[PDB]
Design a protein around this motif. Structure first.
Motif, short mmCIF file in Angstrom:
data_model
loop_
_atom_site.label_atom_id
_atom_site.label_comp_id
_atom_site.label_asym_id
_atom_site.label_seq_id
_atom_site.Cartn_x
_atom_site.Cartn_y
_atom_site.Cartn_z
N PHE A 173 0.85 -1.16 0.00
CA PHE A 173 -0.01 0.01 -0.01
C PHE A 173 1.11 1.45 -0.01
CE2 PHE A 173 -4.58 -1.62 0.76
CZ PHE A 173 -4.11 -3.00 1.08
N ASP A 174 1.91 1.26 0.84
CA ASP A 174 2.97 2.35 0.68
C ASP A 174 3.58 2.60 -0.46
OD1 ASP A 174 2.44 2.97 3.79
OD2 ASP A 174 4.13 1.48 4.18
N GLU A 175 3.95 1.53 -1.05
CA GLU A 175 4.70 1.58 -2.54
C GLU A 175 3.70 2.06 -3.52
N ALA A 176 2.46 1.93 -3.50
CA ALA A 176 1.35 2.36 -4.37
C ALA A 176 1.20 3.83 -3.96
CB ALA A 176 0.14 1.57 -4.35
N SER A 223 -11.59 -8.32 1.17
CA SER A 223 -11.97 -6.98 0.81
C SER A 223 -10.68 -6.37 0.82
CB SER A 223 -13.16 -6.42 1.60
OG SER A 223 -13.96 -5.63 0.89
N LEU A 224 -10.34 -5.63 -0.09
CA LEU A 224 -9.53 -4.48 -0.31
C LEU A 224 -10.32 -3.22 -0.47
CD1 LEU A 224 -6.31 -3.96 -1.76
CD2 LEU A 224 -7.98 -2.88 -2.93
N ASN A 225 -9.84 -2.02 0.24
CA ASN A 225 -10.33 -1.01 0.32
C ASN A 225 -9.38 -0.06 0.34
OD1 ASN A 225 -11.22 1.63 1.89
ND2 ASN A 225 -13.25 0.66 1.04
N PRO A 274 -15.43 -2.29 4.92
CA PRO A 274 -14.68 -3.08 4.46
C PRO A 274 -14.98 -4.39 5.22
CG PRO A 274 -13.53 -1.06 4.48
CD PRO A 274 -14.62 -0.86 5.24
N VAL A 275 -15.41 -4.31 6.76
CA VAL A 275 -15.73 -5.56 7.24
C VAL A 275 -16.92 -6.18 6.50
CG1 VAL A 275 -16.54 -6.34 9.71
CG2 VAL A 275 -14.16 -5.24 9.46
N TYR A 293 -5.07 -6.12 7.25
CA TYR A 293 -3.68 -5.65 7.03
C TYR A 293 -3.59 -4.53 6.01
CZ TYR A 293 -2.47 -10.60 7.89
OH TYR A 293 -2.45 -11.78 8.36
N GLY A 294 -2.40 -4.04 5.92
CA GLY A 294 -2.33 -2.72 5.16
C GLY A 294 -1.51 -1.68 5.79
N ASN A 295 -1.75 -0.41 5.22
CA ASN A 295 -1.12 0.81 5.79
C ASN A 295 -2.14 1.75 6.42
OD1 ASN A 295 -2.05 2.19 3.73
ND2 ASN A 295 -0.16 2.69 2.77
N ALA A 296 -3.29 1.09 6.76
CA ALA A 296 -4.26 2.31 7.37
C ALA A 296 -5.37 1.51 7.96
CB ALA A 296 -4.67 3.45 6.39
N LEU A 297 -4.91 0.81 9.13
CA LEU A 297 -5.71 -0.23 9.53
C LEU A 297 -7.19 0.15 10.06
CD1 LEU A 297 -3.48 -2.60 11.44
CD2 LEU A 297 -3.94 -2.59 9.14
#
Length: 244
Positions: free
Chosen positions: A15-18, A216-218, A145-146, A35-39
């Motif tokens: 996520f950081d790299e995008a 689910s990706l958000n 997203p949940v 998971y990800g960079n903005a939980l």
């Protein structure tokens, strides 16, 4: 084996790299993993955008507003994207995220039956407001997203309150990738109206041995961004976790 500290770090980095902010929720059985960079996005409400096509299709088919082979003709008017200027089945419109076909289906369903059905399924905040043909883009319908990963889980396992056959028909529309004996079923979404803009990829992996793992990706889409970032982050995440 790889530590969870390392898994968390790798997926945050995608996520950081995008250069976006986002979360991917994975469900294994009953356990939800974020998971990800903005939980903290995990239980925030966003518009479903095109993810709503999955439910629009379930409702239209269940209520006989369309069949899976009916061809929705292009009316000949200029459409936002040239690939939408063609005649298509619900299934082809699903893959192309052709909003005009889905707007036609929503209008056949009508505001009243749409409201009842969306309430009945308990989708997101369940409010569709007064315009049957635009409620998934700029409100009032929202979902977290949940809630999206729980909807995917329900659809993947045929647990939604629609005929098994309706669910199978919509599921056949959602196959987007095969990867080492794994099938990925998902619907993408890109809400370009709202600010900031929202990107979705909600679906599940069906593994070789029959197990289904919903996700689910958000994330936040920005003016600079390509749509396939949603896929790339997702595939990289599911692979990092050895799901595919």
């Amino acid at each position: 084996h790889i530590s969870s500290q390392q898994h968390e770090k790798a997926i945050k980095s995608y996520f950081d790299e995008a250069q976006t902010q986002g979360v991917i929720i994975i469900k294994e059985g009953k356990n939800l993993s974020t998971y990800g960079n903005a939980l903290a996005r995990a239980n925030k409400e966003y518009v479903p955008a095109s993810t709503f096509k999955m439910l629009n299709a379930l409702i239209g088919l269940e209520n006989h507003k369309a069949t899976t082979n009916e061809i929705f003709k292009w009316d000949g008017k200029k459409r936002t994207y040239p690939m939408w200027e063609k005649d298509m089945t619900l299934g082809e419109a699903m893959a192309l995220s052709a909003d005009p076909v889905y707007q036609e289906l929503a209008r056949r369903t009508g505001l009243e039956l749409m409201q009842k059905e969306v309430k009945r399924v308990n989708f997101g905040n369940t409010n569709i407001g007064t315009q049957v043909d635009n409620f998934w883009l700029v409100g009032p319908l929202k979902i977290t997203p949940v809630q999206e990963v729980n909807f995917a889980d329900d659809l993947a396992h045929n647990r939604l309150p629609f005929k098994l056959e309706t669910q199978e028909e919509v599921k056949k529309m959602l196959l987007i990738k095969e990867v080492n004996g794994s099938k990925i079923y998902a619907k993408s979404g890109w809400g370009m109206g709202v600010t900031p803009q929202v990107g979705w990829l909600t679906g599940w992996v069906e593994q070789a041995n029959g197990k289904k793992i919903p996700f689910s990706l958000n994330l936040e889409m920005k003016e600079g961004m390509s749509g396939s970032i949603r896929n790339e982050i997702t595939y990289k995440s599911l692979e990092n976790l050895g799901i595919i």
